């Protein structure tokens, strides 16, 4: 049987932050990954 090899998912993680002087809330952006692998 013939198998495809697809590399496991990966990508950079960037943090969205308003300036700390305003607040400490943070939202995280996972680059180029479907919202299932998370």
């Amino acid at each position: 049987e013939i198998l495809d090899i697809t590399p496991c998912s990966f990508g950079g993680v960037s943090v969205i932050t308003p300036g700390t002087n305003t607040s400490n809330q943070v939202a995280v952006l996972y680059q180029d990954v479907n919202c299932t692998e998370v």
Binding site: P7, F10, G11, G12, Q31, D32
Partner: peptide, 22 residues
Amino acid sequence: KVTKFNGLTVLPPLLTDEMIAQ
């Protein structure tokens, strides 16, 4: 007319072609 997995990530542009058209 105008026409891999090694850590090479292609970031998307901020203005999609749609807003550029506007």
